[PDB]
């Protein structure tokens, strides 16, 4: 009566995108993963071998093993009162890189640069990010912009 298979409730999850069926592309085949990289798991439905479980769809982990056609990803999952580490063997079509990780690398390069100049001219660095400070004092010109008065509209039915 009740079923929990490997791909139960995975209809729209393992569907392809619209006008995106067919062969998967050689950029996703030629990207390189080295041990320590951080990758995002989103399953591709065309390649049935090496597919992850539905729990790991859209999930981020650290690659620990790189082999012939797959990579091994460590994912923390929440069961009970503890997180468990899971070691998945997923193929490179289901594995993609993490744009948060590349932007973090560009930010550490920019920070290293900024500290390098700030040390060269002897000025304090101001390196860490600050959140959105509220606002500052401002002047607005009425010249060419006289405030137009708005009033609430009456009720007219359109149907």
């Amino acid at each position: 009566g009740k079923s929990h298979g490997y791909r139960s409730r995975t209809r729209y999850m393992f569907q392809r995108d619209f006008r995106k069926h067919g062969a998967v592309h050689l950029s996703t085949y030629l990207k390189v993963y080295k041990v320590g990289d951080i990758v995002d798991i989103k399953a591709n439905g065309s390649i049935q071998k090496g597919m992850p479980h539905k729990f790991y769809q859209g999930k981020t982990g650290v690659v620990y093993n790189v082999t012939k056609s797959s990579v091994g990803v460590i994912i923390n999952k929440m069961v009970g009162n503890r997180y468990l580490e899971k070691r998945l063997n997923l193929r490179v079509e289901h594995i993609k890189h993490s744009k948060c990780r590349q932007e973090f690398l560009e930010r550490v390069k920019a920070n290293a640069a900024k500290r390098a100049e700030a040390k060269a001219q002897g000025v304090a660095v101001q390196l860490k990010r600050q959140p959105a400070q509220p606002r500052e004092s401002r002047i607005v010109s009425t010249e060419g912009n006289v405030p137009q008065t708005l009033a609430p509209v009456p009720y007219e039915t359109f149907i």
């Binding site: 620990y64 093993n65 082999t67 009970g80 009162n81 503890r82 997180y83 468990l84 580490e85």
Partner: protein, 58 residues
């Protein structure tokens, strides 16, 4: 004698009463499941590196 079948009430409260804190990562994680080819090479490379450092230290 019908009864209640399944309920997820209070489960999140018990879990967060003793929370989920962390998997407690370390430096040098375990090499369980890495490729045996290049695991053997890792063994020999570390042996050679230790011997080279000891020989340079004298």
């Amino acid at each position: 004698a019908k009864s209640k079948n399944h309920t997820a009430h209070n489960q999140t409260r018990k879990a967060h009463r003793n929370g989920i804190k962390k998997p407690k990562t370390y430096k040098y994680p375990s090499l369980k499941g890495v490729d045996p080819k290049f695991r053997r090479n890792h063994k020999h490379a570390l042996h050679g590196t230790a011997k080279a450092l000891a020989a340079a230290k004298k």
